[PDB]
Nucleic acid binder design. Sequence first.
RNA 1: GUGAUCUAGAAAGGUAUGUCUAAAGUUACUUAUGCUCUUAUUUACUAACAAAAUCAA
Lengths: 98, 456, 71
Amino acid sequence: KEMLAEARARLLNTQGKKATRKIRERMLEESKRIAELQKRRELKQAGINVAIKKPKKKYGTDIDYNEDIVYEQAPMPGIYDTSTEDRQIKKKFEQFER
Amino acid sequence: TEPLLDILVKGETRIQNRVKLGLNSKMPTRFPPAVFYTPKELGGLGMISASHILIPASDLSWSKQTDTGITHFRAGMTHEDEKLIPTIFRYITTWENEFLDSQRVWAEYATKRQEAIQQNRRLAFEELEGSWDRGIPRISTLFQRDRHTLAYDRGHRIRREFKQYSLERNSPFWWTNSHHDGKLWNLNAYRTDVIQALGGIETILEHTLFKGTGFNSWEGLFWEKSQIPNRRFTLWWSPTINRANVYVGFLVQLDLTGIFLHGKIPTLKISLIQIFRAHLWQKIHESIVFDICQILDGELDVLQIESVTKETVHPRKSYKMNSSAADITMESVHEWEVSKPSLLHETNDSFKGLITNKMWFDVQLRYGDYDSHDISRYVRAKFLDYTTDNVSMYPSPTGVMIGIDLAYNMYDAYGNWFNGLKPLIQNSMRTIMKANPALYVLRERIRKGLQIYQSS
Amino acid sequence: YKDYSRYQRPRNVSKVKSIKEANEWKRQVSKEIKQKSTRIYDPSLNEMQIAELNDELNNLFKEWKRWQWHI
RNA sequence: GUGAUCUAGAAAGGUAUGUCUAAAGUUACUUAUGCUCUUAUUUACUAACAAAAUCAA
């Protein structure tokens, strides 16, 4: 049965080193993130505001996707005059940020 | 067969190239045939030479059409020194000789056996000793211990041949069974003859670090382990591998010591850093300077000195081969007449040349190669160069220079002598080269790296 | 030079030297204060481990008191 | 009773790799172990070190 308990566990574990390590690094990265967020909340409990640090650039031209429209492929200019519709998204999107 | 002889040459050179590729050098001068062909008892590979042979190169066109004969010899294996190395075809008696021997011997065995039958007696075992290892089944098989159970073994030629379909490996003597045929060949004469083909054991040990260990004779050394490792091999033949007769090679002067490496031999560099560690070169040079100066003012009245002085040695000086300076400086009660500069074991001089107050002593340690291990040439060359040099700071144009070869534990002094120095200083250098503890750490550690232990 | 990133605490606070020197030993506490404070709130679930880590925090924070006390 | 003379040593080949480093603020007086130089023996880790082949008893 101990041979069978070893065989039952080996047949049901399919990943290898690289996937299990990627899982572990992903859990530890989120645990670091959850810790850093509650820090800012506990400092906000004291009223002192500390901003979240951005991730460090790995290479030179690394993109802050949050900073801008990433590769802004605007839609092709059409005829049906989307003028009132842009005003209502902007009013709705500013309402959502509020 | 001509192309077999070419392939023997091509194989043996390629395996010698394989050992040469074990280091980073395919130099001829680094690899004399004493490296490859001396037996394992003396520290070589123990290769068997078969291709130091003049090869018959007689006239390729018309050789296909007549069998011209042998009219021209091509040199098979050529080295810088022409040591004549025996080849084992001379050591194996030929088949027609072995077979014609066997017709007579088994006839002579048959007659002597019939004489044991008629005289109704057991065989003598010493009457037959004259033909003991003789005959193609090898008469020794008749008197084997397990001969009664080998007799049932039949079909053993064929079973040995079909081992090649059962076994992953080969047994290349597939045509002999040593239990049925005995031993058919002996190569014990090849070991002795290669030893005296390289000039004898003493000429071989000139190529080695055997003088560096401090041992007197060879007869009390077994060997530590039947395979010698690669670091022990490249440190055993190391004065030939790091020699000054190299074709090309960039001089580097090690790091803390005075050994020069011609190029990069990375296995030999590792061993010599372990031999010279914790600043052993300075510790050796300080220990000799400390020992002479004690012996000098030991006879301070007879040698008639005022005082001995250690000039304070820069610790880089002891391995600086470019130029040197004075180590020990002599002050005289009254003024000394120093003779012409002469050798340590020179007989006698006319003292009446020059009268000088202040003398000096300098110590030069060197690590000898196979090229330059004569110190007496070396020490006089360093002496004339430095005394003519205006860079080398001496107190006066006086003094002796005391040279020591560490790789061969030799010593000589070349310089001027006032009276009473030379039977004193020779007795001191006998005692110093046998009793210096720093030189004992040198000798012992080399014995550890070379793994050679006395008969003890 | 000489980094202050190599050596130990050093153990006694009163034996430390001039004020421009203990300033850098003091920030040589505060970083590990910052590092292991971030290691408090983590959901990594080892309750025994974060208890001994909590004691190390209280130890280093008492040292931080002592380095301020010397100044 | 002569001669013809090949070579040639350096790199990558030994290690991963990755992450972190509020000091400098962006307008609403609690005080608690200082690892010593050499030699020998024993234990643990470690070299991802090495190794009986033909053959002779």
